[PDB]
Structure formats: structure tokens, C-alpha cells
Amino acid sequence: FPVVLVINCGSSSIKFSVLDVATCDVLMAGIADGMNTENAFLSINGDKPINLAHSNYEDALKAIAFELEKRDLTDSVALIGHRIAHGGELFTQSVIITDEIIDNIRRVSPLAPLHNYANLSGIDAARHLFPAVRQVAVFDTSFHQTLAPEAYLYGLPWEYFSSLGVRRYGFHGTSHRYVSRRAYELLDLDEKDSGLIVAHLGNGASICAVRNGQSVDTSMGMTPLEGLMMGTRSGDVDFGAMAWIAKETGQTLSDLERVVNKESGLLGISGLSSDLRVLEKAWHEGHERARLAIKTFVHRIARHIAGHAASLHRLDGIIFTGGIGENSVLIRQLVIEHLGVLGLTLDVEMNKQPNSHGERIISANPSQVICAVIPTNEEKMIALDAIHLGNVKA
Amino acid sequence: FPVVLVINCGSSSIKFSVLDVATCDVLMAGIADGMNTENAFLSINGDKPINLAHSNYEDALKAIAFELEKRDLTDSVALIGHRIAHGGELFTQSVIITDEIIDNIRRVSPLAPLHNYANLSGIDAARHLFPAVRQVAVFDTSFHQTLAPEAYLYGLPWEYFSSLGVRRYGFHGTSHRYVSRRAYELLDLDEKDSGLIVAHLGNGASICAVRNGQSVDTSMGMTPLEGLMMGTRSGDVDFGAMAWIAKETGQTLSDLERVVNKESGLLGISGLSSDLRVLEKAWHEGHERARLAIKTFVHRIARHIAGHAASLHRLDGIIFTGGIGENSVLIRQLVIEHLGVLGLTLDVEMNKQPNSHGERIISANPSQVICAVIPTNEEKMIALDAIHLGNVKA
Ligand SMILES: Nc1ncnc2c1ncn2[C@@H]1O[C@H](COP(=O)(O)O)[C@@H](O)[C@H]1O
Ligand SMILES: Nc1ncnc2c1ncn2[C@@H]1O[C@H](COP(=O)(O)O)[C@@H](O)[C@H]1O
């Protein structure tokens, strides 16, 4: 029974999963946190953190490989999948990693300096430790490459796009792609004749319009700062307002970039938490700013769901996914009730059901548009691409 | 026959109109251009520019008053209407100008330093030259004050809103208000039970959602930089992208603010013109970048029209207004065809009709939503507020 090793290298951690090729089931999962710091530890399935002390990306991947060996599945690793943050314009699909690909990843790495260079460090490590294993790169931007110029061009001077490559790229592509495929089965839709809106709500929040199997619009921009308001991210923000704050408080562009990424969003408005479970409980206890943060969060999602619907000839489905989208009974209902204009009617018995019920339809019968919850599986989608590319001569 | 003098003071010009109280008809109109410069001239109805040479706001208003006297209508001026750019949170409706109002205008003037201080200079001048005449302030933001916190709060730290007043204000309020009123008559709608989308396309471009006579969402933000892409303005732009350009080109926040306001938008993408008539002709001659600029322009309008529709319980009408919205047969159709999801069908015979046909319905019969063109009259709306306030004890 061969397996796929899925690796996601962040700036501060390394997340990994081992999926069984036969059933696409998770056999092992873990996180190597506190990366590049003075203290680095490795937890597997939450099985008590084991430290390495001042360890790098290569040493951490070697520790995971040693734990991979302790369970006798090292020689069973047939494929290695790498999650890549930014693929620029060069990558439209998942590819088998070669010297050419690496060079191309380094080319578009300036577009995401924090995340993309960390991905390359993971590629270099896995190459060193598993050279006779086929390795695959899956890009978080590639799905959105089917966008037309009108959908990705910014109203900036053309030169920024042609010379520097300033345009909408969009993220959560792997998730949007996975959820799309599942929606055609759950809603019983013909891919070649369909219009979906996928709402990935969780860590980061993004919307995607999927027309006839292709991504036609997405809420995130060149960076994950554009679009929906998030946990700590501001979302859509007037540049004039940002320029006004820079003059009135005397802050640098770096200072405001810190504020927008880490001090804003749900955390910013409420002044309490970035976690939704905390804010839901706070509002339940009569916290006004927690109510406002959630109400604003809901509003901007509804605004973008209806907004992205314009890039469709016909609206068949709205799919909720991600940590928030799969679990929050409240957020789903408030968003759908905010979208009464589109002729949606919700089934509250179905919307009450917890995530254990998996891929479920939550809209009632008289509804013009089918509303559904589909749990996203980014690890399975990476594995599926890897399995497909595992049958290929390179 | 008493008259209303309407004054709009920009940073570089003074636009004025004299409307007859009885019929709300324009009797005289002119522009004093090149304000505060070494050479300032005054044109009335395009009746050959007459220079004053190095003239200020008070001297220019005195020249208009002298030309007002030459036509024997100085003693006929019953009311003076002032267009004010930014009213902050303090002004929800048009008011009679007193010492209190002036102080309050200066309070919120930091929110629009370029335009708002010029408005005060016009107020000071008209006070000096017409002290026994009732004077009224009409605010370009006041109509959007009915917005709920979820619609105007940014995903920034709460402190920026509470201390500095960073929130969505929105503009074109006078136009959105005027067009709304007219729509209830043209579409035969009950104000208290209606949902409209008003698309003001022209100089600046903004969208407004009008639920039951009240503004519930608007595309422009704290500054007119947010929302739709415009002639020279970028519109919605990823802050992460703007921060990325600042690092890669080594430009100041002031440099990028210049680029976004004057070098971007339709002019930015095409690299040709901010004027739509030029770009329409250019695309007709096979100019690709003029086609892209227009296609992108259309796309962002459709995205925001459908987006703002979420803030409505029911969509009754989409109204096109402004220089572009009233005249561009192409832009109207491309936008409506982009909004096929909402179930709109256009009557192309009606959409062909030039602006001379005034307030006209452009959608066919099977259409789910009525599409119409209503010419905006910001001068008439200012006069109407002034006439109403002219019957009041102060
Ligand atoms: N039962 C729940 N109700 C509401 N929000 C939840 C729940 N479980 C997880 N979340 C949110 O999901 C987010 C995590 O997103 P993700 O990284 O996609 O799992 C966190 O910000 C949580 O606030
Ligand atoms: N016949 C027309 N066709 C297309 N665009 C027009 C036409 N007339 C005026 N415009 C546009 O309207 C804008 C002026 O807007 P406004 O200041 O609202 O009159 C300009 O940018 C013109 O490009």
C-alpha cells in the first residue's frame, strides 16, 4: 500500500500529512512549529511535542522522515506533494517538480516573499531526503488563472502589470477547485453548464465564482489582503483612507501593513479575538463590538457572494466551506438571510446539522439557488494531482 | 420671480448656476476657472472667457455678482445653495448656514482637505456679498448617513473609527438622492417598499443601494478612491499590492496617491485617455488596451451593482445616471448583459435612444428587474432643499 507525503511549509511552521493512495485517507498528520527559532518542536497527531532545539527546515524534515521510518512507511512513500503559495502567471496546473519548475518558482517568489521562499526550502529538503521519489508542486493560485483580463486587471497604469506583474491572482485555489468538483456530484450538475459561488470561510476568507468548471472571479487579489474581512486581516480597504491614516498618525507603509495583517479584521473591530467561537459567545453575553465584528463580517461576505454572481450566466449553487463555513450555523444563516434578494430559502433543520454530516444541502425546496456545505480537503486534492502525475513519463 | 444661486467651489474652479424658483429651470450658468493661479478667467454659458488676472475666491465671486447685477437679477436672489464635499457624521440633511454650521464644517474638513476648505471659502465670500440672503449647505455625503455600522465600518482597529473617524462616508449623495426620488415616479414604486440600485457613472463613478427610500450601501469609501474604477481613479485596489509597489519602485505614499488619483483608471490601463468617447472610438479602430479599459470598467460596475443588491430585500430597479450613464449606449448594454444572472432583459430599441429622451425605461417586458435611465440634476436638488429651507424660521 503506497502513500503520498503532503508538505506545507509556512514561514514559522511545517505542516504534513501522509495519505493512503488506495483510499485517500489520512494515516498520519503533524506540525513542526517554531521554525528557524531558538526552539523548534515536532508534534504528530497531538502526540506530545518533541523538541529539536534551534532547528532549520532541513533538520525538521529529517525528523519527520525519521518518524516516518519508525512507523515503517519510508519505503512506502511513492509521491511527495508540495503546497506552493504563489505560482504567478507561469503555473496554470499542478506539475512534476524538476529543475525548470524550481527556477520558475524562484522567478515568481518576489510576489509572495514570506511564504514562497519557505516552500522552496521544503522542496530542497524533500529532494535531499527522497531523491528517488517523484515530487509534485500544487499551487494555491493556479485555479484562478482562467480569469479574463477584465477580472484580474487593476485600474493602475498598465506598466505595473506588464513590467512588474501587478494583477489579481487570488488564493485558496486548491480548496475552491476541490469544493467545485464535489458540488457537481452533490448538486447533480453538468460541469460544462454550471455557475457556482464557493465561500471559503476560515483562516483566510475568499470567494470564488466558478462558471462551467472554470474560475472566473475571486475575492482575494495580488495578496491575500484584498476581499473579505478576516480574523486579523482587514479585507477591502480604501487606499485614500490608508493614505490619510499615514499622514494623521505618522506611520510608515510597513507600519500599516503590520496593522492590516495582524491587528485588523475581526480582532480589530471587536478588540477581543480573531476566533469566531469567542465572538459568538461574547455577543451571546451582550458584547456590542463582537456583534458588530460578526455583522460586518457577514455583510462583506454577502456583498462579495452577490458581487461574484455577476460573473455567471446563471446561479446554481452557493457552497460554504472552510473552518467557519463548515461549522458556524449562525454565520451561514446570517449570510443567506442577507442574500434574500437572490431568492434563497434556508432549511434551518438542515442548517442546524453539525459538520459530521459532511457534504449536505442546507436550502429548502422553494429556493431559487441551492445552498450547501461541503467540507474542503486540500490534502486529498494535492494527493489526487500527485496520483495523476504519478502515471506520467518525466 | 425669485431665483436660487447655486455655488460649487472646487480647489481650482468655481461652478455656478442660477435657477428660477418657480420652474427650477436654469437661467444662467458659468465657471470661474484657474482659481488662485496667476491667471483666472470667468466664462458664462461659454460666452467668451473674461480674465481677472491673479484673482482669489472672494474676487471671483464678486465678478459673478457683478455679472449677476448686469442682468438685473442681484436683487432677485432669494437663496444661495452651497455644494459641500464632506459632511462627516455631523450632517444627515441639508441645513441653513449659520455660525454653528460653519464651525462644524471646519471640524470635519480634515476628512477632505482639498475640496472642503475651498467650500468654506465660497461660504465666506457669499456671506460677505449677500448677507441679507438666506444661505444653505448641501452635503455630498449626507444621504449615505442612513448606512448601518456593518455597511460603513472598515476591518481596521476600532480605534481609527472612534478616535479619528475612519469609516465609509460615500459620495454623489445629492445625485443618488435626486435619481432615487425620480425613480419612484418613473417605475411607479412605493418608496416605503422598494429596492433600487443607482449607478452614477461619469466624472467619478459610484454605486448606491436604496432600500425603502434610504441609502443602505455605497461603493465609494472615506475618500472617492474606493469602489468603481474611473477616468483617472483606480477604484478598488489591493493594499498589499500598493505596499508591494512601494518597496519595488521606491515610491512614497504621496507618490502612489498621485498615481491612483490622476494617472490611473481608464487612463491608466489604456494609456490613451480618461474620456470614454475617445476609448469607444479607439476600440472601434481595433485598439486592444482601450477595449480592456472599457471591459474592466464594465466588469467592476457589474460586480458592484450585483454586490450592492445584497443590501436589498428585493431588487426592483437599476438606474443609470451621470455623464456616462445617460449617454453611453455601449456601456449600459455591456453592464446589463454582464448582469444576466439577475434575470435582466434589455430593450435595445429603447437603449439606443439618446439622452434627449430624458427619463426613460430601457428594459424589455420579460425582465425581472426594470432598467432605466434618469438624467441627474444636482442643481435642481440643491434648489429644492433651499426652497424648502426658505420657508423656515431661523
Ligand atoms: N464550531 C465553530 N463555530 C464557529 N466558528 C468556528 C467553529 N470551529 C472553527 N471555527 C472557526 O474556524 C476558523 C479556522 O479556520 P480553518 O483554518 O479554515 O479551520 C477559526 O477562526 C474559528 O473561529
Ligand atoms: N456620448 C457619450 N458617450 C460616451 N461617454 C460620454 C458621452 N458623453 C459624455 N461621456 C462621458 O461622461 C464623462 C463626464 O461625466 P460627467 O462629469 O458626469 O458629465 C466623460 O468622462 C465622458 O467620457
PDB file of C-alpha atoms and ligand atoms in Angstrom, chain B residues 202-203 274-277 280 322-324 327-328, ligand 2:
ATOM      1  CA  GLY B 202     -19.330  59.895 -15.184  1.00  0.00           C
ATOM      2  CA  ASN B 203     -16.737  62.208 -13.627  1.00  0.00           C
ATOM      3  CA  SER B 274      -9.728  59.259 -19.452  1.00  0.00           C
ATOM      4  CA  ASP B 275     -12.554  60.248 -21.819  1.00  0.00           C
ATOM      5  CA  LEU B 276     -14.846  57.362 -22.783  1.00  0.00           C
ATOM      6  CA  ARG B 277     -15.793  58.788 -26.218  1.00  0.00           C
ATOM      7  CA  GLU B 280     -15.014  53.859 -27.656  1.00  0.00           C
ATOM      8  CA  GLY B 322     -24.342  60.693 -14.896  1.00  0.00           C
ATOM      9  CA  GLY B 323     -22.360  61.698 -17.997  1.00  0.00           C
ATOM     10  CA  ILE B 324     -21.550  58.103 -18.948  1.00  0.00           C
ATOM     11  CA  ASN B 327     -25.163  58.882 -22.923  1.00  0.00           C
ATOM     12  CA  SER B 328     -23.157  55.668 -23.404  1.00  0.00           C
TER      13      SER B 328
HETATM   14  N1  LIG C   2     -21.993  60.342 -25.791  1.00  0.00           N
HETATM   15  C1  LIG C   2     -21.154  59.827 -24.857  1.00  0.00           C
HETATM   16  N2  LIG C   2     -20.739  58.537 -24.927  1.00  0.00           N
HETATM   17  C2  LIG C   2     -19.907  58.007 -24.008  1.00  0.00           C
HETATM   18  N3  LIG C   2     -19.424  58.701 -22.958  1.00  0.00           N
HETATM   19  C3  LIG C   2     -19.758  60.006 -22.762  1.00  0.00           C
HETATM   20  C4  LIG C   2     -20.665  60.657 -23.725  1.00  0.00           C
HETATM   21  N4  LIG C   2     -20.826  61.925 -23.303  1.00  0.00           N
HETATM   22  C5  LIG C   2     -20.091  62.077 -22.170  1.00  0.00           C
HETATM   23  N5  LIG C   2     -19.454  60.933 -21.848  1.00  0.00           N
HETATM   24  C6  LIG C   2     -18.558  60.716 -20.680  1.00  0.00           C
HETATM   25  O1  LIG C   2     -19.077  61.314 -19.491  1.00  0.00           O
HETATM   26  C7  LIG C   2     -17.993  61.739 -18.661  1.00  0.00           C
HETATM   27  C8  LIG C   2     -18.334  63.058 -17.981  1.00  0.00           C
HETATM   28  O2  LIG C   2     -19.101  62.777 -16.814  1.00  0.00           O
HETATM   29  P1  LIG C   2     -19.984  63.914 -16.093  1.00  0.00           P
HETATM   30  O3  LIG C   2     -18.961  64.784 -15.403  1.00  0.00           O
HETATM   31  O4  LIG C   2     -20.882  63.139 -15.159  1.00  0.00           O
HETATM   32  O5  LIG C   2     -20.719  64.599 -17.220  1.00  0.00           O
HETATM   33  C9  LIG C   2     -16.765  61.865 -19.551  1.00  0.00           C
HETATM   34  O6  LIG C   2     -15.701  61.084 -18.999  1.00  0.00           O
HETATM   35  C10 LIG C   2     -17.188  61.334 -20.909  1.00  0.00           C
HETATM   36  O7  LIG C   2     -16.276  60.344 -21.396  1.00  0.00           O
END
